[PDB]
Structure 1
Amino acid sequence: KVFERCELARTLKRLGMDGYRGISLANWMCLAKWESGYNTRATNYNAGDRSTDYGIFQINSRYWCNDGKTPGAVNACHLSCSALLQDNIADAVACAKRVVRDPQGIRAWVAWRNRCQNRDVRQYVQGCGV
């Protein structure tokens, strides 16, 4: 599914994302907008390294989830990558929390550095009741 902005924002707040390891809700919103345009079924194959990025946060199969088809991969989220293609994003959120427990935090996503870091991301949550 393709979330609407404010419904997403409340969905993520319910799932404990606001201020998770120091990360405001707006940053997560910015990350989701730029990774997938709020589309849980979004995928991107990386021909270069044989990995795939899954779902609304575009979580990569090499490190985080299992798809069976990525060399030398580990599954730190302990999930099938299919869990990251669901309408219900709880599993994707749990995995995203796990990504940011590692030592880069949100910096693990390059789209966040490009499109979010040291920018004014207030607009993402404006009007949403969060």
Structure 2
Amino acid sequence: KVFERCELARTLKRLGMDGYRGISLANWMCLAKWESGYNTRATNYNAGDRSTDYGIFQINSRYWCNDGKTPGAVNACHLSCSALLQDNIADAVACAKRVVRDPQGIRAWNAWRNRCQNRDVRQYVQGCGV
């Protein structure tokens, strides 16, 4: 599923994401935007270390979900990577929260640093009613 902007913002808010561990809704929207363009089916294989990023948040298989084909990987979110490809993003969200419970927080995702950190991310939630 490819969410529309405001549709995603409200979905995320409903799921307890606004300000989770100090991360505002706008930041999560900025992350989802740059990671997958609000696309839950999105997947990217990383030839360099043979791992794969899954879903709307492009979560990596080496450390967060199990896809059975990533070498010496772990499954911290305790989910099949397939769960990160559903139209229903509740599992993707539970996993995204798990990722930020670690020291780096939202800095876990490089795309956030490159395109969201220290920027005016107000535009991602404006007019959405969140």
TM-score range, shorter chain: over 0.9
User: How far is the alpha carbon of 1:127 from its aligned partner?
Assistant: 0.2
Q: Which runs of 5+ in 2 are unaligned?
A: none
Aligned ranges for residues 86-101 of structure 1 at < 5 Å?
86-101=86-101
Number of residue pairs aligned between Structure 1 and Structure 2: 130
Task: Find the aligned partners of 1:67 and 1:125 in 2 and give their Cα distance.
Answer: 33
Task: Find the aligned partners of 2:121 and 2:93 in 1 and give their Cα distance.
Answer: 20
User: How far is the alpha carbon of 1:90 from its aligned partner?
Assistant: 0.0
Identity %: 99
In structure 1, the partner of 2:46 is 46
TM-score, normalised via structure 1 length: 1.00
TM-score, normalised via structure 2 length: 1.00
User: How far is the alpha carbon of 1:42 from its aligned partner?
Assistant: 0.2
Task: Find the aligned partners of 1:125 and 1:108 in 2 and give their Cα distance.
Answer: 22
User: How far is the alpha carbon of 1:85 from its aligned partner?
Assistant: 0.3
Task: Find the aligned partners of 2:101 and 2:14 in 1 and give their Cα distance.
Answer: 19
- Deviations 1:51-109, CA, capped at 9 Å, x for gaps: 00000000000000000000010000000000000000000000000000011001010
Moved over 2 A (4+): none
User: How far is the alpha carbon of 1:113 from its aligned partner?
Assistant: 0.2
Give the superposed CA RMSD. 0.2
In structure 2, the partner of 1:124 is 124
Task: Find the aligned partners of 1:23 and 1:106 in 2 and give their Cα distance.
Answer: 7
- Deviations 1:2-44, CA, capped at 9 Å, x for gaps: 0000000000000000000000000000000000000000000
Task: Find the aligned partners of 1:102 and 1:62 in 2 and give their Cα distance.
Answer: 16
